[PDB]
Amino acid sequence: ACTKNAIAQTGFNKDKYFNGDVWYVTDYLDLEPDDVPKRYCAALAAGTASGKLKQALYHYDPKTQDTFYDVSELQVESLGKYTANFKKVDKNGNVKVAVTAGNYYTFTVMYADDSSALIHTCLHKGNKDLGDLYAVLNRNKDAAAGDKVKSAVSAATLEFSKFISTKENNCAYDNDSLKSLLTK
Ligand code: HEM
Numbered sequence: 001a002c003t004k005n006a007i008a009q010t011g012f013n014k015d016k017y018f019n020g021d022v023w024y025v026t027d028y029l030d031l032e033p034d035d036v037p038k039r040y041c042a043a044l045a046a047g048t049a050s051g052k053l054k055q056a057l058y059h060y061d062p063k064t065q066d067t068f069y070d071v072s073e074l075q076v077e078s079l080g081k082y083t084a085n086f087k088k089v090d091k092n093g094n095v096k097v098a099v100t101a102g103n104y105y106t107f108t109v110m111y112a113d114d115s116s117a118l119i120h121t122c123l124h125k126g127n128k129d130l131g132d133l134y135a136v137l138n139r140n141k142d143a144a145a146g147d148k149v150k151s152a153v154s155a156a157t158l159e160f161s162k163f164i165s166t167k168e169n170n171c172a173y174d175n176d177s178l179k180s181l182l183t184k
């Protein structure tokens with residue numbers, strides 16, 4: 001179960017975050033692990049498509065090869081805090097699992113600048129029991145977490161030393177598919 005009400009960044013700049021570009025997860029902290037593997041690759045694109053607030057997601061397990069993409073429209077709870085349904089899609093946006101009641105995630109942007117972000121997400125999916133997930137994002141897939149985002153981790157009363165890095169997993173991403181999924 002999720003236990004945190006994450007606080008969105010004061011003065012969050014929504015147009016900069018939702019600019020249509022790709023974010024890569026470089027480090028993550030799951031408050032309920034054996035929630036997720038110890039090795040993982042994830043990325044997203046976020047933008048406004050025909051007036052609608054969207055995110056496309058990519059997950060890859062580099063050991064099992066389990067791969068999936070999702071498209072989400074984001075509903076606004078408050079600035080920097082969103083509730084998103086999701087549909088599972090192939091990389092071309094064809095629907096594999098439709099939007100469904102009970103399948104949604106919350107998404108809070110705790111910190112963001114032009115290059116980096118810290119987010120919280122609580123996933124709800126059927127009758128699974130899932131927990132709080134924090135993710136450090138970067139516009140560059142290879143970027144070590146810099147001082148601004150590491151300080152934000154501290155300011156959220158978390159320890160960056162506990163975050164698990166995705167950098168050793170040889171992650172390769174289809175940026176083109178993530179961007180085009182925003183429209184789907
Ligand atoms: C970037 C922020 C993230 C968001 C918004 C997000 C969101 C989601 C969503 C919406 C699903 C369900 C997809 C579907 O069934 O169609 C999902 C599944 C999953 N995610 Fe993430 N995720 C993120 C990052 C991560 C990270 C970093 C990990 C590794 C710790 C991870 C591990 C997983 C796993 C293992 C599943 C499958 C759970 C299941 O089969 O029910 N995700 N995620």
Ligand SMILES: [N]
Nearest residue numbers: 036121123133
């Ligand atoms: N997730």
